[PDB]
């Protein structure tokens, strides 16, 4: 019960560091923050939805 | 001839010139080029890359460029046949050969002016000695002995040119060169590893030789990637890492 919210406050913090840190592209060309940019560009348009991809989530934190 | 050292005999001659690179079509030769490229774009050496596919196209390519340039480099082509005749070049043109095919043709070995070989001689080579294959009654009495010599030659040829095989990959000779100059990187190490793995994939070398070469390359891999001993937590995740694996023989099972 008391460990429930204490786990959650540690998952809701590792799901947040995924959106905030996941990048694409290599080092030769240049990078791109994939989900911050889509969050911003979908919020400013007034859409309020991102499309997370499960392969990315897997490759960041298994 | 045989190039004794690659620094002061192959590189520092073409360092100030305009070379022309002929390239065969196999993963070994691609990975043997992509290192020489990166070794030329680092010292501002004007080259030119001609992709050939046979002997007819190599001859056609040599037809057109044979007056502008007078340096050449052949990569995985033209070490098992004779060169000074199929191309019929001039005298002041130089050829470098960095091929894997075996055995090296005879005349290409006793021609120390125009066809230099970047082939490390500590491979499985047993080239016959020089005069064994190259040049009144007493006249006939001795020309019969020369006829005996020719008869021995007709046999020792058949002894030497009867089996074809492959030596150390090109992309490992080039990497030895690129390490001598102290200008090696990971990107030039991955191409070495790929140019070696390809021979074993296409089954052109023996398992003994493959494991020997892997044993060689692992020292380099550990020299580069071990320098990150405990700082692997403060190294950029977006920076290539090569690692030694003892892994399955299934093909493409990770995709």
Swiss-Prot record, chain A:
<comment type="similarity">
    <text>Belongs to the MCM family.</text>
</comment>
<comment type="function">
    <text>Acts as a component of the MCM2-7 complex (MCM complex) which is the replicative helicase essential for 'once per cell cycle' DNA replication initiation and elongation in eukaryotic cells. Core component of CDC45-MCM-GINS (CMG) helicase, the molecular machine that unwinds template DNA during replication, and around which the replisome is built.</text>
</comment>
<comment type="subunit">
    <text>Component of the MCM2-7 complex. The complex forms a toroidal hexameric ring with the proposed subunit order MCM2-MCM6-MCM4-MCM7-MCM3-MCM5. Component of the CMG helicase complex, a hexameric ring of related MCM2-7 subunits stabilized by CDC45 and the tetrameric GINS complex. Interacts with ANKRD17. Interacts with MCMBP. Interacts with TONSL; the interaction is direct.</text>
</comment>
<protein>
    <recommendedName>
        <fullName>DNA replication licensing factor MCM5</fullName>
    </recommendedName>
</protein>
Curated annotation (Swiss-Prot), chain B:
<protein>
    <recommendedName>
        <fullName>Cell division control protein 45 homolog</fullName>
    </recommendedName>
</protein>
<comment type="function">
    <text>Required for initiation of chromosomal DNA replication. Core component of CDC45-MCM-GINS (CMG) helicase, the molecular machine that unwinds template DNA during replication, and around which the replisome is built.</text>
</comment>
<feature type="modified residue" description="Phosphotyrosine">
    <location>
        <position position="130"/>
    </location>
</feature>
<comment type="similarity">
    <text>Belongs to the CDC45 family.</text>
</comment>
<comment type="subunit">
    <text>Component of the CMG helicase complex, a hexameric ring of related MCM2-7 subunits stabilized by CDC45 and the tetrameric GINS complex. Associated with ORC2. Interacts with HELB.</text>
</comment>
């Amino acid at each position: 019960a008391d460990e429930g919210q204490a786990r959650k406050s540690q998952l809701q913090r590792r799901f947040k560091e995924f959106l905030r840190q996941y990048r694409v592209g290599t080092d030769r060309t240049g990078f791109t923050f994939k989900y911050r940019d889509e969050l911003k560009r979908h919020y400013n348009l007034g859409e309020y939805w991102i499309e997370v991809e499960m392969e990315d989530l897997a490759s960041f934190d298994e | 001839m045989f190039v004794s050292d690659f620094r002061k005999e192959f590189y520092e001659v073409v360092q100030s010139q305009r070379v022309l690179l002929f390239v065969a079509s196999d993963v070994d030769a691609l990975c043997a080029c992509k290192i020489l490229q990166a070794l030329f774009q680092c010292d501002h050496v004007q080259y030119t890359l001609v992709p050939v596919s046979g002997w007819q196209e190599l001859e056609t390519a040599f037809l057109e460029h044979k007056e502008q340039f007078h340096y050449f480099i052949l990569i995985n082509c033209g070490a098992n046949v004779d060169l000074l005749d199929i191309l019929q070049p001039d005298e002041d043109t130089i050829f470098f050969v960095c091929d894997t095919h075996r055995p090296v043709n005879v005349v290409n070995v006793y021609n120390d002016t125009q066809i230099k070989l970047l082939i490390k001689q500590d491979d499985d080579l047993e080239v016959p000695a020089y005069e064994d294959i190259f040049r009144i009654v007493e006249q006939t009495m001795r020309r019969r002995q020369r006829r005996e010599w020719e008869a021995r030659r007709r046999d020792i040829l058949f002894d030497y040119e009867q089996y074809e095989y492959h030596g150390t990959s090109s992309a490992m000779v080039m990497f030895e060169l690129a390490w001598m100059l102290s200008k090696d990187l990971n990107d030039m190490l991955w191409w070495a590893i790929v140019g070696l793995t390809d021979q074993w994939v296409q089954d052109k070398i023996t398992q003994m030789k493959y494991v020997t070469d892997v044993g060689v390359l692992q020292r380099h891999v550990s020299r580069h990637n071990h320098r990150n001993e405990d700082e692997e937590n403060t190294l950029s995740v977006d920076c290539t890492r090569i690692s030694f694996e003892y892994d399955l023989r299934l093909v493409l099972y990770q995709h």
